[PDB]
Protein backbone atom coordinates (compact mmCIF):
# COMPACT_ATOMS: atom_id res chain seq x y z
CA UNK A 1 0.00 0.00 0.00
CA UNK A 2 2.65 2.80 -0.27
CA UNK A 3 2.17 2.81 -4.06
CA UNK A 4 -1.34 4.29 -4.13
CA UNK A 5 0.27 7.67 -3.89
CA UNK A 6 1.60 8.99 -7.21
CA UNK A 7 4.91 10.69 -7.85
CA UNK A 8 5.79 9.04 -11.21
CA UNK A 9 3.13 9.20 -13.97
CA UNK A 10 3.38 6.48 -16.59
CA UNK A 11 2.87 7.96 -20.05
CA UNK A 12 1.05 5.96 -22.68
CA UNK A 13 2.93 5.03 -25.91
CA UNK A 14 3.14 7.56 -28.83
CA UNK A 15 1.79 5.75 -31.78
CA UNK A 16 -1.12 5.07 -29.43
CA UNK A 17 -1.64 8.80 -29.09
CA UNK A 18 -1.04 9.64 -32.81
CA UNK A 19 -0.37 12.93 -34.45
CA UNK A 20 -1.61 12.52 -38.03
CA UNK A 21 -1.90 14.32 -41.35
CA UNK A 22 -5.44 14.55 -42.70
CA UNK A 23 -6.91 16.67 -45.59
CA UNK A 24 -5.58 20.02 -46.79
CA UNK A 25 -3.24 19.42 -44.02
CA UNK A 26 -5.62 18.76 -41.17
CA UNK A 27 -4.16 16.81 -38.30
CA UNK A 28 -5.61 14.28 -35.82
CA UNK A 29 -4.38 13.38 -32.35
CA UNK A 30 -5.56 11.19 -29.46
CA UNK A 31 -7.29 13.46 -26.97
CA UNK A 32 -4.88 11.97 -24.39
CA UNK A 33 -2.13 14.29 -25.61
CA UNK A 34 -3.88 17.51 -24.73
CA UNK A 35 -4.16 16.08 -21.19
CA UNK A 36 -0.55 15.08 -21.04
CA UNK A 37 0.60 18.57 -21.99
CA UNK A 38 -1.67 19.86 -19.23
CA UNK A 39 0.26 17.86 -16.66
CA UNK A 40 3.72 18.45 -18.16
CA UNK A 41 3.27 22.20 -18.34
CA UNK A 42 1.92 22.28 -14.75
CA UNK A 43 4.66 20.03 -13.50
CA UNK A 44 7.24 22.24 -15.18
CA UNK A 45 5.71 25.58 -14.14
CA UNK A 46 5.67 24.04 -10.63
CA UNK A 47 9.39 23.36 -10.65
CA UNK A 48 10.18 26.87 -11.94
CA UNK A 49 7.84 28.33 -9.32
CA UNK A 50 9.73 26.60 -6.56
CA UNK A 51 13.04 27.64 -7.91
CA UNK A 52 12.21 31.29 -8.69
CA UNK A 53 11.26 31.77 -5.07
CA UNK A 54 8.11 30.62 -3.46
CA UNK A 55 5.04 32.55 -2.29
CA UNK A 56 2.83 29.97 -0.52
CA UNK A 57 -0.56 30.82 -2.08
CA UNK A 58 0.78 30.48 -5.61
CA UNK A 59 2.62 27.23 -4.91
CA UNK A 60 -0.47 25.54 -3.63
CA UNK A 61 -2.61 27.13 -6.31
CA UNK A 62 -0.45 25.34 -8.82
CA UNK A 63 -0.16 22.14 -6.78
CA UNK A 64 -3.94 22.12 -6.96
CA UNK A 65 -4.04 22.46 -10.75
CA UNK A 66 -1.35 19.90 -10.89
CA UNK A 67 -3.41 17.47 -8.86
CA UNK A 68 -6.52 18.03 -10.95
CA UNK A 69 -4.39 17.41 -13.98
CA UNK A 70 -3.11 14.10 -12.69
CA UNK A 71 -6.77 13.16 -12.45
CA UNK A 72 -7.54 14.18 -16.02
CA UNK A 73 -5.39 11.65 -17.85
CA UNK A 74 -6.29 8.85 -15.41
CA UNK A 75 -9.99 9.60 -15.23
CA UNK A 76 -11.89 12.64 -16.39
CA UNK A 77 -15.25 13.51 -14.92
CA UNK A 78 -14.88 12.01 -11.48
CA UNK A 79 -14.10 15.54 -10.37
CA UNK A 80 -15.18 18.07 -12.98
CA UNK A 81 -14.75 17.51 -16.72
CA UNK A 82 -11.80 18.91 -18.84
CA UNK A 83 -12.51 20.38 -22.29
CA UNK A 84 -10.62 20.99 -25.53
CA UNK A 85 -10.87 24.69 -26.22
CA UNK A 86 -14.26 26.13 -27.47
CA UNK A 87 -15.44 23.79 -30.19
CA UNK A 88 -16.48 20.68 -28.37
CA UNK A 89 -17.55 20.63 -24.75
CA UNK A 90 -16.44 17.08 -24.79
CA UNK A 91 -14.74 15.09 -22.13
CA UNK A 92 -11.28 14.46 -23.39
CA UNK A 93 -11.16 10.68 -23.31
CA UNK A 94 -9.40 9.79 -20.12
CA UNK A 95 -7.38 6.62 -19.93
CA UNK A 96 -10.27 5.40 -17.85
CA UNK A 97 -12.76 6.42 -20.50
CA UNK A 98 -10.55 4.26 -22.75
CA UNK A 99 -10.85 1.08 -20.72
CA UNK A 100 -14.60 1.34 -19.84
CA UNK A 101 -16.29 4.14 -21.84
CA UNK A 102 -19.63 4.29 -23.68
CA UNK A 103 -17.74 2.15 -26.17
CA UNK A 104 -14.34 1.67 -24.65
CA UNK A 105 -11.78 -1.09 -24.55
CA UNK A 106 -12.73 -4.30 -22.66
CA UNK A 107 -16.12 -3.32 -23.87
CA UNK A 108 -15.58 -3.18 -27.62
CA UNK A 109 -13.06 -6.02 -26.93
CA UNK A 110 -16.06 -8.10 -26.75
CA UNK A 111 -18.42 -6.29 -29.10
CA UNK A 112 -16.37 -7.47 -32.05
CA UNK A 113 -13.35 -7.20 -34.36
CA UNK A 114 -13.19 -7.69 -38.14
CA UNK A 115 -12.14 -11.02 -39.58
CA UNK A 116 -9.61 -10.93 -42.44
CA UNK A 117 -11.09 -13.81 -44.49
CA UNK A 118 -14.71 -12.78 -44.52
CA UNK A 119 -17.53 -12.11 -46.93
CA UNK A 120 -21.27 -11.29 -47.09
CA UNK A 121 -23.94 -11.44 -49.79
CA UNK A 122 -27.66 -11.96 -50.30
CA UNK A 123 -28.92 -15.46 -49.82
CA UNK A 124 -31.15 -17.54 -52.01
CA UNK A 125 -32.65 -20.99 -51.60
CA UNK A 126 -30.55 -23.87 -53.01
CA UNK A 127 -33.20 -26.73 -53.38
CA UNK A 128 -30.84 -29.19 -55.05
CA UNK A 129 -28.01 -28.38 -52.72
CA UNK A 130 -27.54 -31.02 -50.04
CA UNK A 131 -27.25 -30.18 -46.28
CA UNK A 132 -23.58 -30.98 -46.72
CA UNK A 133 -22.79 -28.09 -49.08
CA UNK A 134 -23.76 -24.55 -49.98
CA UNK A 135 -23.57 -22.41 -53.12
CA UNK A 136 -20.89 -19.72 -52.95
CA UNK A 137 -20.32 -17.12 -55.71
CA UNK A 138 -17.05 -18.01 -57.42
CA UNK A 139 -16.43 -14.31 -57.74
CA UNK A 140 -16.49 -14.26 -53.96
CA UNK A 141 -14.49 -17.46 -53.48
CA UNK A 142 -11.75 -15.83 -55.47
CA UNK A 143 -11.14 -12.94 -53.09
CA UNK A 144 -11.78 -15.20 -50.12
CA UNK A 145 -9.35 -17.93 -51.05
CA UNK A 146 -7.05 -15.49 -52.84
CA UNK A 147 -3.72 -16.60 -51.27
CA UNK A 148 -4.70 -20.27 -51.40
CA UNK A 149 -5.27 -19.76 -55.12
CA UNK A 150 -2.10 -17.76 -55.78
CA UNK A 151 0.15 -20.58 -54.72
CA UNK A 152 -2.02 -23.05 -56.58
CA UNK A 153 -1.54 -20.94 -59.65
CA UNK A 154 2.26 -21.39 -59.33
CA UNK A 155 1.95 -25.18 -58.89
CA UNK A 156 0.34 -25.07 -62.33
CA UNK A 157 1.41 -23.24 -65.49
CA UNK A 158 -1.05 -20.36 -65.05
CA UNK A 159 1.58 -18.17 -63.39
CA UNK A 160 5.35 -18.09 -62.68
CA UNK A 161 5.07 -16.64 -59.20
CA UNK A 162 2.93 -15.07 -56.56
CA UNK A 163 3.42 -11.40 -57.50
CA UNK A 164 2.67 -12.60 -61.01
CA UNK A 165 -0.38 -14.55 -60.00
CA UNK A 166 -1.45 -11.38 -58.22
CA UNK A 167 -1.23 -8.98 -61.15
CA UNK A 168 -2.71 -11.73 -63.21
CA UNK A 169 -5.93 -11.25 -61.23
CA UNK A 170 -5.80 -7.56 -60.37
CA UNK A 171 -8.21 -6.94 -63.30
CA UNK A 172 -11.41 -8.87 -64.10
CA UNK A 173 -10.94 -9.15 -67.86
CA UNK A 174 -7.52 -10.78 -67.46
CA UNK A 175 -8.55 -14.05 -65.83
CA UNK A 176 -7.92 -17.15 -67.88
CA UNK A 177 -10.70 -19.75 -67.41
CA UNK A 178 -7.80 -21.87 -66.09
CA UNK A 179 -7.88 -19.93 -62.82
CA UNK A 180 -11.41 -21.09 -61.97
CA UNK A 181 -10.17 -24.62 -62.52
CA UNK A 182 -7.44 -23.80 -60.02
CA UNK A 183 -9.77 -22.32 -57.39
CA UNK A 184 -12.34 -25.10 -57.84
CA UNK A 185 -9.36 -27.38 -57.10
CA UNK A 186 -8.19 -25.42 -54.01
CA UNK A 187 -11.63 -25.62 -52.47
CA UNK A 188 -11.81 -29.43 -53.07
CA UNK A 189 -12.49 -30.46 -49.51
CA UNK A 190 -12.27 -27.26 -47.61
CA UNK A 191 -15.43 -25.80 -46.05
CA UNK A 192 -16.64 -22.46 -44.82
CA UNK A 193 -18.88 -21.03 -42.22
CA UNK A 194 -22.04 -19.04 -42.77
CA UNK A 195 -23.56 -16.71 -40.29
CA UNK A 196 -27.02 -15.22 -39.96
CA UNK A 197 -28.18 -11.85 -38.63
CA UNK A 198 -28.88 -12.51 -35.02
CA UNK A 199 -26.55 -15.29 -34.02
CA UNK A 200 -28.74 -16.63 -31.27
CA UNK A 201 -27.55 -20.16 -30.72
CA UNK A 202 -24.57 -22.25 -31.80
CA UNK A 203 -26.34 -23.37 -34.94
CA UNK A 204 -26.37 -19.64 -35.83
CA UNK A 205 -23.16 -20.47 -37.62
CA UNK A 206 -22.84 -23.68 -39.65
CA UNK A 207 -20.16 -25.22 -41.85
CA UNK A 208 -20.63 -26.52 -45.42
CA UNK A 209 -18.65 -27.46 -48.50
CA UNK A 210 -18.74 -24.76 -51.13
CA UNK A 211 -19.95 -25.51 -54.63
CA UNK A 212 -18.84 -22.48 -56.62
CA UNK A 213 -21.51 -20.80 -58.62
CA UNK A 214 -22.22 -17.91 -60.88
CA UNK A 215 -23.47 -14.54 -59.98
CA UNK A 216 -23.98 -12.58 -56.85
CA UNK A 217 -26.30 -14.67 -54.57
CA UNK A 218 -25.31 -17.35 -51.98
CA UNK A 219 -27.13 -20.68 -52.37
CA UNK A 220 -28.36 -21.88 -48.94
CA UNK A 221 -29.99 -25.21 -48.20
CA UNK A 222 -33.67 -25.18 -47.23
CA UNK A 223 -33.52 -27.57 -44.25
CA UNK A 224 -31.12 -25.29 -42.36
CA UNK A 225 -33.26 -22.21 -42.97
CA UNK A 226 -34.80 -23.12 -39.61
CA UNK A 227 -31.64 -23.12 -37.54
CA UNK A 228 -30.72 -19.61 -38.75
CA UNK A 229 -33.90 -17.61 -38.72
CA UNK A 230 -33.48 -16.79 -42.39
CA UNK A 231 -36.27 -16.07 -44.82
CA UNK A 232 -35.62 -14.90 -48.38
CA UNK A 233 -36.76 -11.33 -48.55
CA UNK A 234 -33.25 -9.85 -48.60
CA UNK A 235 -31.65 -11.73 -45.75
CA UNK A 236 -27.88 -11.62 -46.15
CA UNK A 237 -25.50 -14.14 -44.57
CA UNK A 238 -21.82 -13.61 -43.90
CA UNK A 239 -19.16 -16.21 -44.68
CA UNK A 240 -15.83 -17.00 -43.03
CA UNK A 241 -12.87 -19.19 -43.83
CA UNK A 242 -11.11 -21.81 -41.62
CA UNK A 243 -7.41 -21.17 -42.22
CA UNK A 244 -5.51 -23.63 -40.02
CA UNK A 245 -5.65 -27.29 -40.81
CA UNK A 246 -6.98 -27.48 -37.26
CA UNK A 247 -9.67 -24.81 -37.60
CA UNK A 248 -10.75 -26.67 -40.70
CA UNK A 249 -10.64 -30.01 -38.91
CA UNK A 250 -13.01 -28.84 -36.22
CA UNK A 251 -15.07 -26.76 -38.67
CA UNK A 252 -15.92 -29.73 -40.86
CA UNK A 253 -15.90 -32.36 -38.11
CA UNK A 254 -17.87 -30.78 -35.33
CA UNK A 255 -19.32 -27.63 -36.94
CA UNK A 256 -20.58 -28.73 -40.39
CA UNK A 257 -24.33 -28.62 -40.80
CA UNK A 258 -25.17 -32.30 -41.57
CA UNK A 259 -23.59 -33.30 -38.24
CA UNK A 260 -25.60 -31.12 -35.81
CA UNK A 261 -29.11 -32.28 -36.60
CA UNK A 262 -30.70 -32.32 -33.08
CA UNK A 263 -31.03 -29.09 -31.02
CA UNK A 264 -29.15 -28.34 -27.78
CA UNK A 265 -32.35 -27.05 -26.19
CA UNK A 266 -34.46 -30.15 -26.79
CA UNK A 267 -33.59 -33.62 -27.94
CA UNK A 268 -36.02 -32.74 -30.76
CA UNK A 269 -34.72 -32.48 -34.34
CA UNK A 270 -34.13 -29.05 -35.93
CA UNK A 271 -33.52 -30.60 -39.36
CA UNK A 272 -37.18 -31.23 -39.88
CA UNK A 273 -39.09 -31.07 -43.11
CA UNK A 274 -40.02 -27.47 -42.95
CA UNK A 275 -42.85 -25.81 -44.83
CA UNK A 276 -42.79 -26.92 -48.51
CA UNK A 277 -41.55 -30.47 -47.78
CA UNK A 278 -44.39 -31.37 -45.47
CA UNK A 279 -46.99 -29.88 -47.73
CA UNK A 280 -45.66 -32.16 -50.40
CA UNK A 281 -45.23 -35.31 -48.28
CA UNK A 282 -48.65 -34.75 -46.74
CA UNK A 283 -50.71 -34.36 -49.94
Amino acid sequence: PEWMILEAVPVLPPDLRPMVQVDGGRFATSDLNDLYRRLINRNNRLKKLLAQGAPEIIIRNEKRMLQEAVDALLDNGRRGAPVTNPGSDRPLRSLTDILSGKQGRFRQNLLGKRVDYSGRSVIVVGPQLKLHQCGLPKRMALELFKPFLLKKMEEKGIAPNVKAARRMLERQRDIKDEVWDALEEVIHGKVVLLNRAPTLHRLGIQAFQPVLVEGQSIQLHPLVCEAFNADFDGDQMAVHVPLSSFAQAEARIQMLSAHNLLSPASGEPLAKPSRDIILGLYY
Binding site: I57, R60, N61, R64, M65, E68, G80
Partner: peptide, 12 residues
Protein backbone atom coordinates in the same frame (compact mmCIF):
# COMPACT_ATOMS: atom_id res chain seq x y z
CA UNK B 1 -15.18 21.87 -4.49
CA UNK B 2 -14.81 24.14 -7.53
CA UNK B 3 -11.28 25.45 -8.06
CA UNK B 4 -11.45 29.16 -9.04
CA UNK B 5 -13.43 30.52 -6.05
CA UNK B 6 -11.19 28.78 -3.52
CA UNK B 7 -7.95 30.42 -4.74
CA UNK B 8 -9.71 33.73 -5.36
CA UNK B 9 -10.86 33.57 -1.79
CA UNK B 10 -7.39 32.25 -0.87
CA UNK B 11 -5.33 35.25 -1.94
CA UNK B 12 -8.14 37.81 -1.78
Amino acid sequence: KISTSDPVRQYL
